[PDB]
mmCIF file of C-alpha atoms in Angstrom:
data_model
loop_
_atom_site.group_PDB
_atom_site.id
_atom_site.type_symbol
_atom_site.label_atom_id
_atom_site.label_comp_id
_atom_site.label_asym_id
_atom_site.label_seq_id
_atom_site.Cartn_x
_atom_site.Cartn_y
_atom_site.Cartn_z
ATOM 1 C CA UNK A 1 19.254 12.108 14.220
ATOM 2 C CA UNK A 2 20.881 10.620 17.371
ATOM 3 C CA UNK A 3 20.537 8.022 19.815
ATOM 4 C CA UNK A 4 19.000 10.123 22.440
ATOM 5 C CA UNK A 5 16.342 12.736 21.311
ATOM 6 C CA UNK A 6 14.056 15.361 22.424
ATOM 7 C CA UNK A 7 10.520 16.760 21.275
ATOM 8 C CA UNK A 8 8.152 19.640 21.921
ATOM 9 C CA UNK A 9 4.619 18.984 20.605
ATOM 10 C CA UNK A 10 2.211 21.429 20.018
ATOM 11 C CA UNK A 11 -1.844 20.689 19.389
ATOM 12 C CA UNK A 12 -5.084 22.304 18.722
ATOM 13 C CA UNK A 13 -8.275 21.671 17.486
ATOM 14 C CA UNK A 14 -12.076 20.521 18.315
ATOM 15 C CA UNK A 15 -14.234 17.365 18.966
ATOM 16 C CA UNK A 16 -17.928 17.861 19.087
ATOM 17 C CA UNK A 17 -17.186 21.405 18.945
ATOM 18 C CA UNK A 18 -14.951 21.475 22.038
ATOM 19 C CA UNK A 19 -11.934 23.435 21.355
ATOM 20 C CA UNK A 20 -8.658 22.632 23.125
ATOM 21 C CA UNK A 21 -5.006 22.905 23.036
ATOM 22 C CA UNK A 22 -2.040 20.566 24.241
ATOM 23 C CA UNK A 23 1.779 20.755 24.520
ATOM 24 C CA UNK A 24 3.942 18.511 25.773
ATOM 25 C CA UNK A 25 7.584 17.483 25.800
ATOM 26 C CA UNK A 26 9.562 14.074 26.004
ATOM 27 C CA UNK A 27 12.727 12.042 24.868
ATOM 28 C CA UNK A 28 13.270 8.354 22.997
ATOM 29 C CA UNK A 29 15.399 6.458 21.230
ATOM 30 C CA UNK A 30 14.682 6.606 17.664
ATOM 31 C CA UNK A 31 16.416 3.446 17.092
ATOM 32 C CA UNK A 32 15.408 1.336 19.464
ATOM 33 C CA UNK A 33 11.654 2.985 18.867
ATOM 34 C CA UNK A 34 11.109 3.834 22.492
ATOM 35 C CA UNK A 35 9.393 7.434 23.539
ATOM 36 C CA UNK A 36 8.085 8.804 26.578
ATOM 37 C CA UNK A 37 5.672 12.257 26.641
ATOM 38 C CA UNK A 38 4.383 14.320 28.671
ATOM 39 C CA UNK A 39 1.418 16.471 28.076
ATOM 40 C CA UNK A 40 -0.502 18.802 29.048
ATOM 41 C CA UNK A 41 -3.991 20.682 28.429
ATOM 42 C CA UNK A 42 -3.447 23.806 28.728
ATOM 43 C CA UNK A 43 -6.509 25.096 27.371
ATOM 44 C CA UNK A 44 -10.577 23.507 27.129
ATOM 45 C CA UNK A 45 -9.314 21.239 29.957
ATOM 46 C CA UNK A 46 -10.671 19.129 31.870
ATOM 47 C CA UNK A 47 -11.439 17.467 28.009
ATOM 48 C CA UNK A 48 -14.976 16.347 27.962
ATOM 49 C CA UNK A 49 -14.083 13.537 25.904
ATOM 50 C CA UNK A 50 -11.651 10.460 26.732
ATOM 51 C CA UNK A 51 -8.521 11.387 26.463
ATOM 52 C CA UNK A 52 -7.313 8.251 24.703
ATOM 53 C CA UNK A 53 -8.848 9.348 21.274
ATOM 54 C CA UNK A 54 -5.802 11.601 20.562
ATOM 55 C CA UNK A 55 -3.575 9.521 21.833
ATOM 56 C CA UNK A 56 -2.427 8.733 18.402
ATOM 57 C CA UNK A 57 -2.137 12.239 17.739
ATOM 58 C CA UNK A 58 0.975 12.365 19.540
ATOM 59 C CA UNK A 59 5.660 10.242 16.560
ATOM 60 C CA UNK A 60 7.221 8.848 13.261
ATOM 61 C CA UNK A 61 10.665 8.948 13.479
ATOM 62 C CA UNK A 62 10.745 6.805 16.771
ATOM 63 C CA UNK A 63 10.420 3.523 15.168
ATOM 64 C CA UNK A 64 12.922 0.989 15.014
ATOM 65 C CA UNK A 65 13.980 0.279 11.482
ATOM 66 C CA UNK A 66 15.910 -3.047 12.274
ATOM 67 C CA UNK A 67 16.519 -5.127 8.720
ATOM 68 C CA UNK A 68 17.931 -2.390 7.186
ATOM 69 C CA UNK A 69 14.345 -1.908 6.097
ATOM 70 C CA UNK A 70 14.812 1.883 4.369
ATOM 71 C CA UNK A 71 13.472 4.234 7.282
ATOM 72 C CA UNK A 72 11.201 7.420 5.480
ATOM 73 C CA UNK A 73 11.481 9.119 8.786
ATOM 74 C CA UNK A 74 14.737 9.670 9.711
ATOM 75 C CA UNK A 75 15.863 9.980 5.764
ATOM 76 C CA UNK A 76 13.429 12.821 5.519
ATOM 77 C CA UNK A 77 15.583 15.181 7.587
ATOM 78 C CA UNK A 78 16.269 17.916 7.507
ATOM 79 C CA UNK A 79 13.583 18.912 5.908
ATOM 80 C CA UNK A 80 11.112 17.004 8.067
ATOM 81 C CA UNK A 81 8.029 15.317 7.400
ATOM 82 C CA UNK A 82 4.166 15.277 7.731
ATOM 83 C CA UNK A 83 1.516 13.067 8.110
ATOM 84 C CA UNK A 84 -2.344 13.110 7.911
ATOM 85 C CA UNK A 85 -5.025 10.721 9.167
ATOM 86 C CA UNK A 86 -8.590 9.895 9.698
ATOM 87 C CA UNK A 87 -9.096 7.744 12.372
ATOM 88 C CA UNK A 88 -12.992 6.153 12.042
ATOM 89 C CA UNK A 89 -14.591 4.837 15.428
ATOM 90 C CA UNK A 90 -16.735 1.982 14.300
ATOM 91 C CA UNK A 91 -19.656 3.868 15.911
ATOM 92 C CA UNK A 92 -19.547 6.782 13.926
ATOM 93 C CA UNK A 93 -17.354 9.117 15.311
ATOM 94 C CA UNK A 94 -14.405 10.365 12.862
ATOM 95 C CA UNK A 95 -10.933 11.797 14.354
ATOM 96 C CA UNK A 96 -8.959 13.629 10.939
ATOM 97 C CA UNK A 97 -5.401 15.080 12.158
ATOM 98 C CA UNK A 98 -3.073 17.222 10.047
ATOM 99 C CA UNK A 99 0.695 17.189 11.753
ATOM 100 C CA UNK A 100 4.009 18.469 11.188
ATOM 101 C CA UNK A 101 7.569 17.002 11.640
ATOM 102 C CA UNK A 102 10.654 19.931 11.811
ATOM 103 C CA UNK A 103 14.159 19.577 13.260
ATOM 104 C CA UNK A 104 14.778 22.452 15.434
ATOM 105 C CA UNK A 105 18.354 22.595 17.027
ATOM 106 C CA UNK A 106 18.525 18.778 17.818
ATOM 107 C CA UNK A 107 15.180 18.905 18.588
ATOM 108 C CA UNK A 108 12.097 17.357 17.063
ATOM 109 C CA UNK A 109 8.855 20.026 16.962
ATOM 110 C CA UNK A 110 5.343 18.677 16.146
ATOM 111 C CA UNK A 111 2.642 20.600 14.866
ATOM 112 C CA UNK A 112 -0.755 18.577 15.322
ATOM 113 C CA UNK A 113 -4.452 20.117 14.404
ATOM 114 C CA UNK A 114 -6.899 18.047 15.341
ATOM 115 C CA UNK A 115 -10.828 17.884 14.281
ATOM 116 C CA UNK A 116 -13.403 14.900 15.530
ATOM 117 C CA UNK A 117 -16.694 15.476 14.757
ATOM 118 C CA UNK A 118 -20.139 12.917 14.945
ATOM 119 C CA UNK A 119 -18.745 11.312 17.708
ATOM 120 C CA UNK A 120 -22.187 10.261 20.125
ATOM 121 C CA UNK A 121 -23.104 12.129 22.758
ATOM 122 C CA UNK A 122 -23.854 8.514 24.512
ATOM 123 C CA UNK A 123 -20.593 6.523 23.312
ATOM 124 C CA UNK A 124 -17.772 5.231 25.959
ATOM 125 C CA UNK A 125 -15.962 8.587 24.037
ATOM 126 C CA UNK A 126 -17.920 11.267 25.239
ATOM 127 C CA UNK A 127 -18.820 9.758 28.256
ATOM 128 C CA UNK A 128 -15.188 9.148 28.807
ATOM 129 C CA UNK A 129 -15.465 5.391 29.375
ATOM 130 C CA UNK A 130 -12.138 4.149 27.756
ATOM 131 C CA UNK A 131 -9.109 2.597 29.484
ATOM 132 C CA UNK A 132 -6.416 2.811 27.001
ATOM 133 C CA UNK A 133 -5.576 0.815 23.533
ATOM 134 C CA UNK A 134 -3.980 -2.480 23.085
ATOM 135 C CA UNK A 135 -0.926 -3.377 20.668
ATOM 136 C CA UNK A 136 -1.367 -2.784 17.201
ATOM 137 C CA UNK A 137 -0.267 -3.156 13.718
ATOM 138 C CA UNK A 138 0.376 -0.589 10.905
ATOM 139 C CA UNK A 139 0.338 -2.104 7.281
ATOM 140 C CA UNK A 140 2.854 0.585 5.436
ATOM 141 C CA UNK A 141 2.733 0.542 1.397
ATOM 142 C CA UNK A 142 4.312 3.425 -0.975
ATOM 143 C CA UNK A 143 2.562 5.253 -2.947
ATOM 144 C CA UNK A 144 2.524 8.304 -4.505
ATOM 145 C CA UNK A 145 6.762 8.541 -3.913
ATOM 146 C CA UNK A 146 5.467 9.057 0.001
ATOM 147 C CA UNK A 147 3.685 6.047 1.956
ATOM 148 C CA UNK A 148 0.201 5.079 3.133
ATOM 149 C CA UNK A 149 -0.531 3.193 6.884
ATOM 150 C CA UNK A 150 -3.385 1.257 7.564
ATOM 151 C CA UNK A 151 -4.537 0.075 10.922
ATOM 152 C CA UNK A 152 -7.019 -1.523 13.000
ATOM 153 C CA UNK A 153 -7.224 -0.948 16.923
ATOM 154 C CA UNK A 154 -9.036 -1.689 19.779
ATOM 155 C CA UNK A 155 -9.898 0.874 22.317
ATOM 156 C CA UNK A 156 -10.253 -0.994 25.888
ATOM 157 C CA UNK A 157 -13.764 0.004 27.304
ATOM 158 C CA UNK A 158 -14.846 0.214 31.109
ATOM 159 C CA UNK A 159 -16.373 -2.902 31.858
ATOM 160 C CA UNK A 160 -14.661 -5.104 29.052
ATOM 161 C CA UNK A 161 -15.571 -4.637 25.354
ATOM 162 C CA UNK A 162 -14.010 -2.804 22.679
ATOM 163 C CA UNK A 163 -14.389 -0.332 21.066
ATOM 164 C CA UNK A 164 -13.007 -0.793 17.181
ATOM 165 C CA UNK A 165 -11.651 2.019 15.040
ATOM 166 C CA UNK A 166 -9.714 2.355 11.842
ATOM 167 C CA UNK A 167 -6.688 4.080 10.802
ATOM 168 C CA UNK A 168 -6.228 5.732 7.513
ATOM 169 C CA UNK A 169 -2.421 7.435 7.154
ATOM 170 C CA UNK A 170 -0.728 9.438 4.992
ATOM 171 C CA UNK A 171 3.482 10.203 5.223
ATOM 172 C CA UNK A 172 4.877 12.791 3.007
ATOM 173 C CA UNK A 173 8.669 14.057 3.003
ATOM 174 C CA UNK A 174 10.124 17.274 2.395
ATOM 175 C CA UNK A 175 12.790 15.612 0.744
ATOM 176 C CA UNK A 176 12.813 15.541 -3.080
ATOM 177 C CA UNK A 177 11.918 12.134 -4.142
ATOM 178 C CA UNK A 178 15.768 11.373 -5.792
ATOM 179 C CA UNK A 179 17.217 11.973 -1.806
ATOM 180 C CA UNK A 180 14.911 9.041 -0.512
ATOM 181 C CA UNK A 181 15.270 5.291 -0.552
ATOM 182 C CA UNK A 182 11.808 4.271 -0.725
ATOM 183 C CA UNK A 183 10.685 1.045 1.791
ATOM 184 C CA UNK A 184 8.855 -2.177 0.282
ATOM 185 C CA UNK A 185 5.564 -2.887 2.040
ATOM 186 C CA UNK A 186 6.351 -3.430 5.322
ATOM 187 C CA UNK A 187 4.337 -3.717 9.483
ATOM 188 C CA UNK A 188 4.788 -1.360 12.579
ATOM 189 C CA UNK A 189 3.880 -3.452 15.589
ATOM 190 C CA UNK A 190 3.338 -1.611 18.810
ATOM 191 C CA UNK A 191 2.096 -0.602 21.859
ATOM 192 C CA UNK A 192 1.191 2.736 23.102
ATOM 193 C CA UNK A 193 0.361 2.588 27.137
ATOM 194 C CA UNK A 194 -0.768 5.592 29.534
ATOM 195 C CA UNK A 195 1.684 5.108 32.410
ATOM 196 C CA UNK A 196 0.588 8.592 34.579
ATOM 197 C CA UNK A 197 -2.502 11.223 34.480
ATOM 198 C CA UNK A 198 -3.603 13.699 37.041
ATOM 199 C CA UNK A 199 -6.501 16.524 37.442
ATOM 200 C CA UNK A 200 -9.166 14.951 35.189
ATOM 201 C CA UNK A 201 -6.798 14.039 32.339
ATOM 202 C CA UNK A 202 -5.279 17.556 32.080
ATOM 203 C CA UNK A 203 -1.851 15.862 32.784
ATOM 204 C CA UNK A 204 -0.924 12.636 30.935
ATOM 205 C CA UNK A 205 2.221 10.537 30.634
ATOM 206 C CA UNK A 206 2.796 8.431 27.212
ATOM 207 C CA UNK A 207 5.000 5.731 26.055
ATOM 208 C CA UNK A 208 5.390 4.245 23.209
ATOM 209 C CA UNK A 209 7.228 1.358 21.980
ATOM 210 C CA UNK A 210 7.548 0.303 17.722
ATOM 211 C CA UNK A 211 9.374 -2.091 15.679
ATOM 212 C CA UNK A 212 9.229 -2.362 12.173
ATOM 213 C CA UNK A 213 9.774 -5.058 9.983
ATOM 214 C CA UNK A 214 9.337 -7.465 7.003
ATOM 215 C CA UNK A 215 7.035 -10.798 7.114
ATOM 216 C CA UNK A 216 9.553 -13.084 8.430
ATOM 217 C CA UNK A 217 6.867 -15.853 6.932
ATOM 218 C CA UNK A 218 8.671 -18.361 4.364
#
């Protein structure tokens, strides 16, 4: 794991019974937690649905791990890790992905599968009135010798709400537990912000900044 790295994603699935597929490539510094993607649909495109739902769906191992706070992601390698997650859209859509995190050459590979289902026909989603997320925070905790995230974010809407969903993560590594120096509980800030998109969000350009920590509270 080096100061400069490189990724090839690769992602399927269906929301509201719309199947589509994704790849994308892109480069960060896993220390300094930033990332940039590109992506692409390369299949069910133009997406009927906003874009910005998998957004998400797109990077452990980029995250700044300042305060020598034990980092599961880059102590899971070789081997790799995975994660899981159900995302739940505080109008009742509900986004589950199942991913997976290999080294391959110097080079990062995702695996995502993706499945949304619920979400309503007449919601900012599927009628693709969303303009990105602000900042958040995940709330990591171990458990089960892997870790849990928990987070809240708000999904910008067009003409100024929010729209509110909730995060539910899983991490496991590959690693056997007796390799792995397990984190207290401990916060991801960050910020994920579309900087490009062409053809009806069948090309899209991510970055993604993240810095862990402690509470720094007294």
């Amino acid at each position: 794991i080096t100061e400069n790295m490189h990724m090839k994603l690769y992602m399927e699935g269906t929301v509201n019974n719309h199947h589509f597929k994704c790849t994308s490539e892109g480069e960060g510094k896993p220390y300094e937690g930033t990332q940039t993607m590109r992506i692409k649909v390369v299949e069910g495109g133009p997406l009927p649905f906003a874009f910005d739902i998998l957004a998400t769906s797109f990077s452990k191992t980029f995250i700044n791990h300042t305060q020598g706070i034990p980092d599961f992601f880059k102590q899971s390698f070789p081997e790799g890790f995975t994660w899981e997650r159900v995302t739940t859209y505080e109008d009742g859509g509900v986004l589950t992905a199942t991913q997976d995190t290999s080294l391959q050459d110097g080079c990062l590979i995702y695996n995502v599968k993706i499945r949304g289902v619920n979400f309503p026909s007449n919601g900012p989603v599927m009628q693709k009135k969303t303009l990105g997320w602000e900042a958040s925070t995940e709330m990591l905790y171990p458990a089960d010798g892997g870790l849990e995230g928990r987070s809240d974010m708000a999904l910008k809407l067009v003409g100024g709400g929010h729209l509110i969903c909730n995060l539910k993560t899983t991490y496991r590594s590959k690693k056997p537990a007796k390799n792995l120096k397990m984190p207290g509980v401990y916060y991801v800030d960050r910020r994920l912000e579309r900087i490009k998109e062409a053809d009806k969000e069948t090309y899209v350009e991510q970055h993604e900044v993240a810095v862990a920590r402690y509470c720094d509270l007294p």
